[PDB]
Symmetry: D2
Subunit: 368 residues, 4 copies
Amino acid sequence: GAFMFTSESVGEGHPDKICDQISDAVLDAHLKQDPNAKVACETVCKTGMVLLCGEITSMAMIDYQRVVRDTIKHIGYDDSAKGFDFKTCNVLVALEQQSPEDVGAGDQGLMFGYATDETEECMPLTIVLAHKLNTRMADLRRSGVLPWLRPDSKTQVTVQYVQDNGAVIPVRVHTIVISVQHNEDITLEAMREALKEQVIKAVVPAKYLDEDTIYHLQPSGRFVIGGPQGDAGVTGRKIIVDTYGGWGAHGGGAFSGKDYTKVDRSAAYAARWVAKSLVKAGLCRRVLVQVSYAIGVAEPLSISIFTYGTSKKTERELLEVVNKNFDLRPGVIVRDLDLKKPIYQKTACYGHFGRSEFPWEVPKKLVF
Amino acid sequence: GAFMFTSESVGEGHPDKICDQISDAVLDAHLKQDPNAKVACETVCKTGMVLLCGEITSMAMIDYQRVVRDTIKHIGYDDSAKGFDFKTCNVLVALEQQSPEDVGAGDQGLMFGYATDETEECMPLTIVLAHKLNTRMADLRRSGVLPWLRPDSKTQVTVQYVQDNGAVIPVRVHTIVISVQHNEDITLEAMREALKEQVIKAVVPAKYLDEDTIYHLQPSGRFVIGGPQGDAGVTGRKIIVDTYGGWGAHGGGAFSGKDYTKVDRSAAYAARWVAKSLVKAGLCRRVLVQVSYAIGVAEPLSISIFTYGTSKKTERELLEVVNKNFDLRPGVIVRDLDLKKPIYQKTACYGHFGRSEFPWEVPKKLVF
Amino acid sequence: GAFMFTSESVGEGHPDKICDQISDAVLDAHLKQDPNAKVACETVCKTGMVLLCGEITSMAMIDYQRVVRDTIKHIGYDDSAKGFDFKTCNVLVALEQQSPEDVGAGDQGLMFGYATDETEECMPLTIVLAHKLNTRMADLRRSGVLPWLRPDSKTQVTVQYVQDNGAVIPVRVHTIVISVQHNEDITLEAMREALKEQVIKAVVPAKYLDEDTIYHLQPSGRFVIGGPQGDAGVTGRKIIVDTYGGWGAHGGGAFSGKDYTKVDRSAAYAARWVAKSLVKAGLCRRVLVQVSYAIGVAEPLSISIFTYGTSKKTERELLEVVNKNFDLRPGVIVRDLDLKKPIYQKTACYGHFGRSEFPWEVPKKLVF
Amino acid sequence: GAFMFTSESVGEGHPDKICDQISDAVLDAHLKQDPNAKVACETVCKTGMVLLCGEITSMAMIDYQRVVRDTIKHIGYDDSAKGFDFKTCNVLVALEQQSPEDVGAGDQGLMFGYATDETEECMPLTIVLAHKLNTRMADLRRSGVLPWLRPDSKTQVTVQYVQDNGAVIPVRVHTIVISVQHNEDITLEAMREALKEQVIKAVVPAKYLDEDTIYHLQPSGRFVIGGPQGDAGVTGRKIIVDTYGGWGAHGGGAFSGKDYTKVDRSAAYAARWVAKSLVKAGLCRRVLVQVSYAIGVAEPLSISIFTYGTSKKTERELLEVVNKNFDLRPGVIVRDLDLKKPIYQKTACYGHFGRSEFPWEVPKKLVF
Ligand SMILES: Nc1ncnc2c1ncn2[C@@H]1O[C@H](COP(=O)(O)OP(=O)(O)OP(=O)(O)O)[C@@H](O)[C@H]1O
Ligand SMILES: Nc1ncnc2c1ncn2[C@@H]1O[C@H](COP(=O)(O)OP(=O)(O)OP(=O)(O)O)[C@@H](O)[C@H]1O
Ligand SMILES: N[C@@H](C[C@H]1CO1)C(=O)O
Ligand SMILES: N[C@@H](C[C@H]1CO1)C(=O)O
Ligand SMILES: [K+]
Ligand SMILES: [K+]
Ligand SMILES: [K+]
Ligand SMILES: [K+]
Ligand SMILES: [Mg+2]
Ligand SMILES: [Mg+2]
Ligand SMILES: [Mg+2]
Ligand SMILES: [Mg+2]
Ligand SMILES: [Mg+2]
Ligand SMILES: [Mg+2]
């Protein structure tokens, strides 16, 4: 039942993602010394000018200059011409820091969860490829293989699909668009060549690459001193690339900068968890689990499972499976998913869903 | 086939929405003197400190201090204690301004469109009520009826639904959560009363209000000097409340601050247009139109119509209807929808979709 | 030998003085936990926006938000309309903090010292009155006597003089100009009355007030919401009001924000010390002691005493007196003057010289 | 009657001086299109971040981005590593601009004027050499002779003197300290050599250079990426280097950023004028002219001439000479000195007094 789809992703150097990372870096920095630290911060950046804002109630001694500059360094901003230098950039900290199982969900909410068997990650091929494309470039950057590669990048992958008396089977990569920052001493011809052979063909399965697949490598020509500038970088502004690439559903809640007590993060992770578990357990080929919460109440206020006719069990057979295998109460979620652990920075880029190294990406058994 | 859903909205005083409005105000200010002005700006705010960033190629004389302060005034920030005063706030302008039909879509893209017949607006009841709730409060604020009401507010509406051999029929409002900024001389008891009788019951259809409907009015107690700080307001960070409240699909593209040449705005409007037209024309009760574009190409690179079995015509009968009634090329969109007109500021709050006063909300005839 | 002179002073609310105080507050905050803390910081302010910049090598845990906001509170900025509120203002900290007798003067330098017997403080009448005028207003502000009085103020005192076979004897106050911030509910007539009876006549000696003395109280009319705004407040920009009101000599070195290791502060204090000691010891009625230092060298590179023919001993009789009573080496200065003590904030306003509560203002014995 | 003296100066790259220049550049930019423009602005900078603040009532169309960036370019900040790049730095403009002979002096004031015959400029040798030292380095920088030389520099000159039955005769340069920013590819040994032969010996008269003269060239080692940070540059913070190097007297009034209607600038210039005229006319070898003004009154409220026994005429013979040759009323000053002309930027560095190219530096005839 043909149709096409497109998704995008950005590198660690993208202004918005730098802020997402810095904000989560500050979250990690607090969890390490106080796993109960209450973090609620965000970052704003603009050409060698980083603004750390926020309200965090914690009892840990943190050097914000250090955690911000280290994060910028990690990203690869050490030289001047790159558009950022951790040693010279302005780090204005306007942060306010205080000191002092059946909890109960804060703020009326509605979290979504999604999973599909089109890839081993249980995530849409389009967004998976988009992320992996950026990931590979960072590897080649950090390894030395492609030393002209700079932190800021953007990726878009559009794949042609076809339904299947259930749902969504990828056929081929229609077109790929990739833009990456770079050093001056490297020709546009050499860049485009390296992008096709060393990054694209090294990550995209042969089955999907074609003789007609369209490539748009460095479309706008050069992107040298571009760096994290844009016109400004912000936290929580890359909401779709952090999730499913526009495939599931999204209520609008941002992740980065918020601790594990905010249902926007925790419950979203939990919802992904059950979704991935369901498909992995063969109970369906594609699911859209919807978990609702009521302010004050701990136990979820109605969970809905949305298969697209890919399950044999039947919604409200699968719900009992979820109700017998999962305890989606906020407090239990953080305990079961080990959400007090400082893993948030690595979650701040290349997508929150898909990578198996995260607790919520490990499928639960599911006793049926 | 019961399930529940929640959506939210924010008032004109919400930090993020102030930036969305200011950014669009600057867009309007340019269109009035140069309908071909190229606008690409964004705003950042934090307690009496507004930062205007951006790159705009136009040929019009604009007083940015005036357009920013006027917008803050319009929102209702004229006094000190409110958290913002257009006469005293810092307006730092770091804006860069230059001077000098079958066009062709910029940037690979994928826009979504959505519509449902559950309301006359052809928008989800949950998000419609959420918006209207905030709208009413602004009215009472500006009229004088509720003089304690302040600009910043947040609304959440969760409605219980039930499918219908097609899709989505609202049954009742399960719970409503509303938080609004206020003056000191007004009791929490009087506020909660006014919110239930004068705002909620004055906008929510009797059919949906119940004896069990849950109300959470000013849950967190007092919200006085809670003016625009919210740890830094930003443009393009309220992506879901500007669209369908998490009901359709969203690629992640922000509207505010971008002119009519960016497919992220124009094409999204166009997609909404056809969706609303389809249901209005009786061709379906609920649609998710998906329009894809290819960088360089003008004509859309595959449009997909997604009814949920609510149409009698059948997808790929409805596609021809769309192909015979619509010309979704970028240039034609702006011409047909009159996108060079300065209406963008009023679009910057209370949702981009739903209100009939916008071109894209006027259903096209549809000759079938 | 008639001539006239004018001097000025500013209140604790003056933008520049707020920065001088905040910078010294940060210095005090470090000395209390590490008397060897290396402080080099400065502040910038602009309408509820404070920027703390600087490089400080210390080993003490300081809450910069607390030390900045407390200082703003102390000044009297607690309400909105005053132009500053310590609870709501933006405190952006871009501060960089590290951790790890015959020393030797840093930086070639030339410090000046001055003293005259026209007042018991051994300071020019014009600047003494100017300071005391502002001091009194703060008292009435903090006591409650004049509750309409606000932090920001400016004072100017011009006195008619006459030489005396030596030097400088004040005759009468020619004119006084005083401007002070205020609350709305207070008439310009009532303000001007209170300024003349309760502040001016309560501090200026009867001998100097005349029937012709000119008063300019609130000349520019109102000064309500003025507050610390100007167009910006800065540290080290009020160099003359911090010293002698334009009577001695000044090389240009700023005090506030610099620790005791900077000769600009320490040596200037030391020079004042010896000057005050000389006149107090009857060795002269007016002196201008000039102490020069050589980078690397500890012992002063030539000290010059400048009496205006007011001494009977004779320059290079008085120099030996100074060389036999004083050891102006940097390290000895800090030890003898107890410069590791956190008294710097109170030094940041109303003048560094004159007030007896400071070590350098206590005359040394002088054995001759 | 031996004694020593030291003075300092800074290059065009010094943070404070960049702000002084930028502020005056904005003043020039307005005078060119509206000679009656009311300018009152100041600048703040910090590592690729320039903040333009101010209130200017004028009727001229100015591109502040252009005037700020052009000024940074002129200074020599075009590359990244230098600590500033006019093409990439953040120029935040928070400027507020409106549109619409016997005047009368604004604000009670007391301006000073100074002159001495020890140099042809009629300025202290110490400050003249200090300025010229920085001037020469800029020449070699802009010519190409010393291509490693960067904008930011600091100079200190200490000269040994001796009185002379009147006053002040320089004997020799005791020590010279000079620090200048530089490029990486240049040895500390080569720099120090070039500073002694090509800059110092090329500007300092043979008569003053000795075999004992002490040189401190690049004392602190390397000053590479030491671009304009210096923990925030500011306008009006280099008050003494803009005048007499601590030789005359200074009330504390700043010049840069203020138009010709502010007595702080105009009257100070006028006072210098008469001082230079007096010595040039042989009426004295050293003078300290003191001009006082009364708020509202146009004609100066008492002028005092202070020779140090270097005049044969006798104070109050010289006063009549000044009263018969000069009309120091504010309005007349601007007319006679052509103060509506945009020459203020070149006045913003290397000293306001001394250079003959300025109106106030051209000695008036003096008919006696
Ligand atoms: N001068 C301009 N004229 C027209 N459109 C512009 C202009 N400047 C920016 N834009 C638009 O807004 C978006 C770019 O902003 P930004 O400076 O944040 O860079 P980036 O972070 O490197 O890019 P991106 O976030 O899109 O991947 C683009 O999609 C573009 O359409
Ligand atoms: N719009 C303007 N037009 C002309 N001159 C101005 C203007 N705005 C400011 N000035 C000048 O510069 C100085 C005022 O600046 P500021 O805003 O720092 O206020 P303040 O700190 O409250 O005052 P002050 O420091 O002089 O005691 C005045 O001496 C005045 O001459
Ligand atoms: N930085 C932009 C394009 C570069 C060429 O200006 C981008 O990431 O797409
Ligand atoms: N704030 C200014 C004057 C007030 C009236 O605008 C001052 O301190 O002189
Ligand atoms: K945006
Ligand atoms: K968002
Ligand atoms: K100034
Ligand atoms: K100064
Ligand atoms: Mg990009
Ligand atoms: Mg592009
Ligand atoms: Mg993007
Ligand atoms: Mg004042
Ligand atoms: Mg005045
Ligand atoms: Mg002043």
